[PDB]
Symmetry: D2
Subunit: 308 residues, 4 copies
Amino acid sequence: MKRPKVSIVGAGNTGAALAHWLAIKQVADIVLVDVVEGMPQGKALDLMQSAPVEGFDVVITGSNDYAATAGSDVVVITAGAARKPGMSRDDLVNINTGIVREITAQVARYSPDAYLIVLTNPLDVMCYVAYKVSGFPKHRVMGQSGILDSARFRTFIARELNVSFEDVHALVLGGHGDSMVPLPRYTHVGGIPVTQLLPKEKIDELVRRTRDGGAEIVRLLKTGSAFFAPGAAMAEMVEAILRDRKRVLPVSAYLEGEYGESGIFMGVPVVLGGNGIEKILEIELTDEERQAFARSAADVRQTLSKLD
Amino acid sequence: MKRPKVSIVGAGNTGAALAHWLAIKQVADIVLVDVVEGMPQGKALDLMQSAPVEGFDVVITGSNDYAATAGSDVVVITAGAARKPGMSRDDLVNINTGIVREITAQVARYSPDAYLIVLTNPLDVMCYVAYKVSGFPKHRVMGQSGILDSARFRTFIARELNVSFEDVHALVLGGHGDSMVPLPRYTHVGGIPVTQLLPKEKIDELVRRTRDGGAEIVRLLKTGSAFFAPGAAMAEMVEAILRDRKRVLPVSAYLEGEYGESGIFMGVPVVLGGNGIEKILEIELTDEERQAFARSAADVRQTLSKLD
Amino acid sequence: MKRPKVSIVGAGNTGAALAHWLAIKQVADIVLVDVVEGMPQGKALDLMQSAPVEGFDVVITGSNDYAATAGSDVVVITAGAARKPGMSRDDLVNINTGIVREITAQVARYSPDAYLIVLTNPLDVMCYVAYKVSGFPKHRVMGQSGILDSARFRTFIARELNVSFEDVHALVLGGHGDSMVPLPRYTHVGGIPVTQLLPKEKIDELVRRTRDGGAEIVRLLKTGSAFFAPGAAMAEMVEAILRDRKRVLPVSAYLEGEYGESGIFMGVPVVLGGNGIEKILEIELTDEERQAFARSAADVRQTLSKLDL
Amino acid sequence: MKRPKVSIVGAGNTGAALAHWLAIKQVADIVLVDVVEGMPQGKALDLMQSAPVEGFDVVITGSNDYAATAGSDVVVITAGAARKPGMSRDDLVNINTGIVREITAQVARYSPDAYLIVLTNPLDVMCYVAYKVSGFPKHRVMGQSGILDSARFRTFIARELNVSFEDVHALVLGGHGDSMVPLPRYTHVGGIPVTQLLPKEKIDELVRRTRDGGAEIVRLLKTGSAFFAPGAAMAEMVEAILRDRKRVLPVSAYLEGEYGESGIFMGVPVVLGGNGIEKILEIELTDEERQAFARSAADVRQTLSKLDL
């Protein structure tokens, strides 16, 4: 009877890629919001001008005003600073904390009932910021990070074996880089565990390339970071809510005892559907995987205690 | 540039459903062939008349003459007799041997370079008949069986857990019913082994329903067999070839030592691509599983002995 | 968020083909309903078993009970009888009248706010039956006819010129066969009026093939009627509503003054969106075209005059 | 069976948007080429990392080496300089003539059987440069311009009427801005000529906005130009060739008598298929349209007369 509404805060490469992925799925009308005058308006009109050629019926508009986001079903935060050389990890956390706080207060006011998906680095912590500033219940606040790590690892496995991208699957817990918990046991090619298809040496190498995945694209582009794959990872989450798909994906979810952790967001396997985070799946981990998850959890917990 | 050509022999519900699944993928022009005058012509013109509405550019024609199939990249055999009341195992094998022989001789004459996909039951046996009558090298001859059993098992799991159909995966070896070799270890939900999510008793029931899956659709329809999901399973195999996808799928493939068997077709994991069966994947089986495969193989081998 | 619900009454070739086209669009969960025990259950389960292979997340179920249709956003009626040996013209219509009335009373009870789409022939008359039995307002009741005639005409033109099915467009008014009002002036190939690309005699022969298009498939199949293209045309209408697309399509709509007619369904150009028939567009017609539309309307009133209203 | 191969020269926003639209169609393996080290490599690997999530089987790679384009079925040239404050039409022609010449010499060497699609401004002139430098026959060289102008016009009409983007169609002849030939008679909504649905003043306004559409996006973005829609327009042309769709589209094509002109590229309606430009359709023009097309032709011919090739 009426199409749902998605607002994307940050009309940069990742925000505009997300709008592109969502337009082709015909899942919602889209509002692109950004502080820079003219930019979201132009990307929005440009994308909508592809509609007659590409077949899709969705309206894409741009604003510099959070009021344009009123009555959104899903709001995606793609805005944030990247770490400049001569900038502490704490300086990144403090800058992005202020960015995510201000965006969340504005969007939670214009869409009190929204689902909130965060991308801003560092992701597990920026999800906590969004959670506490919005006042939304836990099922309505989440972050993209595990789907992107998973997507890169699947890509490297598929190219290494030369098999279909559709047939390679991987669950990854934790965050990006050193906070990541790859799971070879939860990594399959057409149902076949990857440990049967690649030697340990090659799996460890592909795991290292996954940990360094975002940095590898930053090195090749030289200015700016990845946008196609992060856009796609977010588009999957938006669509899993709007079409009630009950996807089983790794997402940054608020924990209240799962994996022995309370009071933090971590990258965990969830059922994602029309009521948002519908279930957190607690899977079997080795002592080593549990200890890696716990260490990543401890780092997130002590970063939170330093937030304004 | 010219679109590839696929011929479908048997324009019953299954052949037509396959034509439908192939048309929407925009993967080839499609020729439907059948002995029944008017039927392939009428179904072909109907499906093609959907093109302006559904937006695909595919030409679909019907014929009663195997000449219409000349120069096909792929030919799919869906034709065969229903096992009628009081008809023995051996009578069906004998009727369908003659049907498959006559069709294969004709399609091999008009498309000496084609890939051949068989659906006719009993499927592992009919694959052998088509292979010997065609004279085609083993990489060009294969049967659809495992993808359909895999699909039904995945459906039942997805509905049991109420999760996305996209996120449940299962490898099944062997043929339908009693010759089927389910692999719980090779069955996952979002990378999570299904043994962590469903009790043994439930998994066993879902396996029994999968063995019985074709008969179940038969009992409900009362006349005729499944067509939608057999159609979709065949469409995946046709597309895997035409688009060089290198899909990792269970398909009936000619063995010369793989899984300790020679001189028969069995349901095994393959890499399916632009050169047909490009690899047979040899996976870890338990003693029980290897024995169940050995039994399925012996049964196939004795059927082949009786007939020519 | 919850996916919308579509019920299809009639689980024959066209009902099942419609379910298939809807499933690949991922637009709704689908309930198939038929009187024949097992059939809708069997077709639904088979189609849903394609879902892990084909990538779609929708639940398809079947029932012999109209209660399974409760709370449908869209209900599509595909059931109806074809003319038999020894059966009169007026008997066929009376039999379809009964079938549509019984279905409509059951589906309007279980989904009082639904949009209702009718396929049953004779299509404009059966829409009027559905409209009166349902008590639904006029924006919520409509029939599929013109899209299928448009699609056939477009397919014949595209095959004649050897051009993309995507770049041939045709607006067709009225019903099937003799009730159809084809409009060569509103028929285009990438924006080029088809009268610049095909001479008069060819256009007349492609119009004739379109008028006879349904009977052509019937002659070839020998038992049963077309199902792929009627299925596609209905799926386009169901989607136009559920995703509020505001499609500009020929559908059977209830007229209250449009084209000088009031009190009947006729095939006309509409804006079809999430509030159903949002607008009936009144296009420029020649005197002959207007007279052809008036005679098609008159044959609708001739058919209704014999029905137990 | 092997997937076809498309190379894209220029891995800026437009080249990258093109690769995205092509990846989703699953139509070809893609190679991005650019002079800037790391950039095509990064965009390629980023796009290909979306594949497991979006369900496409296409390999996307990036190179600074033209040799990586060897054996392409289609090569798309998206590279070129934009007009900066204080450079004449002549400066732009000579700069872009130098860029397209160096690109065409390389890509024509590595793929002597390729179809060449040009984006580089000014488009009709830059197509003649690619045609002359490649030595390819006329069916194998073409430019994207009319599809983008049509798409913008169709977008403005659809949003003015609040109707489906799928049901608004427009053929546009000639090039961008003042060279554009809008055709209200070849512009329809669900088959209805747009002159029946909008007053002439509003049409005239949507035409002015179309002539200016390129500059409008540049004003809003402030750095850089449109990329999504130009990307989609080029993707439609690439797909038309690789799947032999025989689409009926406005493209820049080499004329040898058509529309009264020889020895130039102009924006004309073509059938685009597996053999590139398979036909040029000669449509009915009013005196004013014929005169505007002739003036633009004379202008293009004069610009060609001053180039060395």
